[PDB]
């Protein structure tokens, strides 16, 4: 699909059985999630935003459908207010930006 | 363009007669950049990100040239790590995600 900008561009994704909605975001580096359950090995993490750092749970080589297009890689969870999917995942997708 | 995402998607921008880089953020609902110098009159404003909240000074009606393309639109101006164009001036330029 090609998406606008005048709403945010949230898709729906699936990952580790679960449906969530999340945020296709080119100006985050890696993904993000909401705190959720998440199967296997994991390694501790922090990240910095716009407002300091939060501590994460990093998951390697984890599988999501976005807007029905499969990926694997690094998902980063953590208390982040927004589920974000960042380049290490939008480049696996194709997308693209624009104008 | 089109700009895909294996790196950063970095614009040259000018505004308040200066020079910038910024990020292309569709994440990004504003426009955040690094503390600088603007002209007009301000409003004190608070933006929550992935680690908390930051202090910013609100402009409106600011003139932007992204990438060349004229807009004019509101930025906030505080201590953001990385100068940030969002949807607010994205839409402007026409710019759209694709894949
Ligand atoms: C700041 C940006 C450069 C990085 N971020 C992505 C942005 O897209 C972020 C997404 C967000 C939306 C909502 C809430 C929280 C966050 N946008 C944002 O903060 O926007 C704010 C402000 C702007 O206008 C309004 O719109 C939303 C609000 C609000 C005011 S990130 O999440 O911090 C982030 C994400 C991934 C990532 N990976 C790293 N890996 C390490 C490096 C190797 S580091 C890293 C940091």
Redesign the interface.
């Known amino acids: 699909?090609?998406?606008?900008?005048?709403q945010?561009?949230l898709v729906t994704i699936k990952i580790g059985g679960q449906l969530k909605e999340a945020?296709?975001?080119?100006?985050?580096?890696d993904t993000?999630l909401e705190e959720m359950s998440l199967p296997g090995r994991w390694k501790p993490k922090m990240?910095?935003?716009?407002?300091?750092?939060?501590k994460v749970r990093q998951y390697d080589q984890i599988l999501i459908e976005i807007?029905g297009?499969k990926a694997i890689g690094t998902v980063l969870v953590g208390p982040?207010?927004?589920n974000?999917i960042g380049?290490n995942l939008?480049?696996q997708?194709?997308?693209?930006?624009?104008?």
């Open positions: 699909p090609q998406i606008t900008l005048w945010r561009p945020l296709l975001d080119t100006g985050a580096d993000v990240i910095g935003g716009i407002g300091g750092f939060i807007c297009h982040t207010p927004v974000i380049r939008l480049t997708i194709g997308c693209t930006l624009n104008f």
